[PDB]
Subunit: 288 residues, 4 copies
């Protein structure tokens, strides 16, 4: 039988000693680089999928199709490594939440977050309608015997302020969500409070540096009491800076002038050539 990295994530979350550190990846390449560096979890950023798949800002231009194709691909690079995937607002009503839940599960996604924003347009949907997306996800994975981890995100902080944020989290905890995600915590003090306010329920810190949140390392998050830290820009920021200074060097020099170690063979190795080659060798033949 098939196993998923949902089940080992779930099992690590039911354990108070485990802390999940998941760099933000957005494509095959970033996923391979992060895995080679020895990360035991990855986070598929939706801002990065929008940037890579469509070359757009994150304005809600990825469909279910895009987002699931990208999460399934990242989940199956290393199937025993948990992937936490953005799932925006679930791509419609409860029928669409269920469909997303089932498709992410079949794809081997370990966890996905679902938020309280309006599909289209930060504009928010009433709490009732939000818990409706939560319930439909929990019931969907329940129908298919899936251990996928439901993360409940709330984008209500700046809009409606701390207590309303904590209210909407608690409503989603009561409707079955496995983890809470307060977007844009504004101080270390608010991060300690929310751990205490939703005591005993796992929480996820979103660590995008240089924004509403002070810079909190993974050892410090763990000690404040979070259960997951994600860094959605760990790969994007570096990649964009280097591609820009590489492009400009090419435009000056007329040749990329890459280090003698960036052979194409090496980039196929980063992408698991050796493993493909033994998959081909094992089937008999041949081509290598």
């Amino acid at each position: 039988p098939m196993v998923t990295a949902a089940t080992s994530l779930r099992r690590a979350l039911e354990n108070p000693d485990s802390f999940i550190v998941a760099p933000g990846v957005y494509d095959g390449l970033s996923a391979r680089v992060a895995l080679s560096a020895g990360f035991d979890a990855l986070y598929m950023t939706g801002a990065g999928t929008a940037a890579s798949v469509h070359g757009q800002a994150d304005l809600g231009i990825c469909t279910l199709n895009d987002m699931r194709a990208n999460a399934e691909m990242i989940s199956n690079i290393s199937p025993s490594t948990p992937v936490i995937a953005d799932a925006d607002t679930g791509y419609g009503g409860p029928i669409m939440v269920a469909r997303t839940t089932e498709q992410y599960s079949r794809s081997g996604v370990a966890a996905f977050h679902i938020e309280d924003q309006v599909q289209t347009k930060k504009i928010l949907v009433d709490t009732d309608t939000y818990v409706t997306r939560i319930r439909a996800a929990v019931q969907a994975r329940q129908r298919i015997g899936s251990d996928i981890v439901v993360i409940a995100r709330t984008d209500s902080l700046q809009t409606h302020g701390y207590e309303e944020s904590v209210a909407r989290l608690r409503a989603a905890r009561d409707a079955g969500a496995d983890v809470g995600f307060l977007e844009g915590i504004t101080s270390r003090e608010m991060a300690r409070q929310v751990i205490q306010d939703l005591a005993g329920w796992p929480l996820l810190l979103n660590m995008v540096e240089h924004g509403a949140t002070p810079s909190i390392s993974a050892a410090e998050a763990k000690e404040m009491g979070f259960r997951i830290i994600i860094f959605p820009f760990a790969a994007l920021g570096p990649a964009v800076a280097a591609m820009r200074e590489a492009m400009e060097k090419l435009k000056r020099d007329g040749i990329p002038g890459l280090d003698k170690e960036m052979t194409p063979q090496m980039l196929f190795r980063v992408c698991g050539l050796d493993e493909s080659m033994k998959v081909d060798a094992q089937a008999g033949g041949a081509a290598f």
Copy 2:
């Protein structure tokens, strides 16, 4: 009415003076970042497509669906910037070579390259099979009236040597292909020779450094007489070295330590936010 950058690439190649630099791009970011640097053609690498879309080596794992979708979105980031796309071996026989051709045209691809390998090393098909692909591609764009530039590429140098490569390319030239492409050129002298051996007919140099070919710059390639130069790992080697570095620093420190400017807003404006905002604003 409705316009493709194949027409304009096409006329550049007709001007004996135009020299085309196409850096290698693989996704929406690399594409956006290269257009921001001021480049006037792009090159969609299929190795880069296999690495980004699937996380795999360049081993023929991308389907026509896969490649056609990545090339349509890169092509429509800047619809007036010619895009040159890997089309591999045209994704099957004549019927599939024609779908690939029609699907790339509708999508506004400016040029694509078809090679002489099995689908499917390196390992080669015969000149008659290879020319059937080339003729399927030409006759298909003629039926729909597409100006898409058909690039005939050969991988026969390593196995069969120089005269075999040249004759495969003459065979393709005679079947209608607009540009030649001798892959894996092994010396400066052979670069000078192919150009004169196929005088009159424009040629593409694939410049992936530190492989089979000496390191030739845009400037040395235009002296030799190439009409197009491409740099497939131009976005992708820099992105890999930078991510690897950032990940093993994040592993040691427990925090990215990103430069103050690498913010999500930075990325949004790199990805054409101010224009997305104008579109919405203009609709009401």
Copy 3:
């Protein structure tokens, strides 16, 4: 390079042309309608939902799903106009713009956008949000020089009344729409009344039988002054009733018992094997 969007556009500026488009949901139903002699086709979203997804018409189809099926049907016979459901444009003006650009590149002759909320959890959006949709579509096609015909549909007849329905149809006309589409017309006096309320603007009749709408045949509808009549269930209804009977009979017998002309050779002929064979012979 041409699309049927152009020819449908001038068919609609010429006052004597009337468009008869039977509902088609996959490539088979498209090939069968074309063979019957039909000069236009209508891609039902109801049917697309049922076929690609095996689901009721519940807003479960994505722009990815609708656009693939619309490109395919449009390109079975590129010179025959295809009118495609485009639901609510799959989001805000940013998505409405993508939808228009993608259908245009796809060869799709005409598409329709409505005033329902994208995601229920009939419920409509206000008129300004609706007009924003229609405006995003006109502007999007104008930027890329696309002739794709923009059909403004309203589902407000039941929820708001006929006077409101007419006001939303006039507000869509003012925003640049090419054709209007009152959904669910309840009588012929209302039919003749909408044609007159929006005099000089072409209107589309949705003729799904046994609904809110009396039975109006292509000729009567032309005579009244409609310029397009669609029959979304023309293929779906007969396909479903016959497959259900075939299956129950196979369940009873243990063998299908099909007519001797129900063969894989008849299928392939239906689905243009002779032309696929002309194409492959040509490349050789």
Copy 4:
């Protein structure tokens, strides 16, 4: 603990008493319609996929992407019901056969077939064909998938019976679960193959009016087959019905569809009530 119909099928096939009867379905409609007729296995046909998804003959036009998506939609209408899908030649070499196998597994497909034709009737040598079967088996062992590997040979009309048998023995020995002699030409050949490969599950393709005699499910079972498929069960009826309705609509200018043939009815055939329960349970 997420479960797949591959497990129940593979376990049924270990139990001699079990006989598998599956009609051919090509899309969500024809699959809803067969399931409602009481069937407990479904066959996804490749010729019907090409005709529905692409509008084309069964010519090698479908891609892994086309074929895996239609397969996952069909498996997931009734996930406890086993679905046998076509997999052509597995879409490349060991690497693509393995992707095909992984992706089919994750989609809930219960069994698939891989045959011995060239990717692009012309056959590949036994060794190459066995490499695919072996790559299928090893791919699914690696992920712990119970997916059923069916080995198909199309060698009969080109090489005759004894070559056919040699190819299934070689697929068998490499790990395939079931054998599929395409185009069996008599009742005697049918008993001879079942026998020559005793104790190895066989499948009978039953497409009436071809080279195979009409053999019903009951007779196939009595013979020794473990699986009977009816690829054309839904295609034949669908095409004839639509043709006839299309021609009638052309003459009459109105479908004149039966009073039963409505949206409500389609939406019920495609699971409307179950969609509404799911909604009411969410809200809550």
